[PDB]
């Protein structure tokens, strides 16, 4: 069927992790200058106040013992 002429006419017209690293950088007691390393001193009175703390290896030596195969902790 023949198209209406109007249709044809119309168409044509249209066409914080960053800071956490910074804190890790901040907590350094050791830096190198020249040929001589340098180490930070904490105050002696502070060390007296702090408790004696633990050794990590003694607990880990226990931990590998506590998780041993023979124990069958499972």
């Amino acid at each position: 069927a023949e198209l209406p002429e109007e249709l044809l006419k119309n168409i044509d017209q249209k066409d914080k992790t960053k800071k956490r690293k910074t804190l890790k950088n901040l907590r350094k007691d050791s830096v190198k200058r020249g040929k001589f390393r340098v180490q930070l001193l904490s105050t002696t009175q502070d060390s007296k106040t702090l408790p004696p703390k633990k050794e990590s290896s003694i607990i880990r030596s226990k931990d590998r013992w506590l998780n041993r195969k023979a124990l069958n902790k499972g």
Partner: peptide
């Protein structure tokens, strides 16, 4: 014989550590 060893220098303040200079 010339010495070959680390020589750790000790400072109280972290700030003092930052500007530490071998000359000074």
């Amino acid at each position: 014989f010339k010495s070959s060893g680390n020589h750790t220098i000790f400072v109280d303040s972290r700030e003092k550590m930052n500007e530490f200079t071998p000359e000074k």
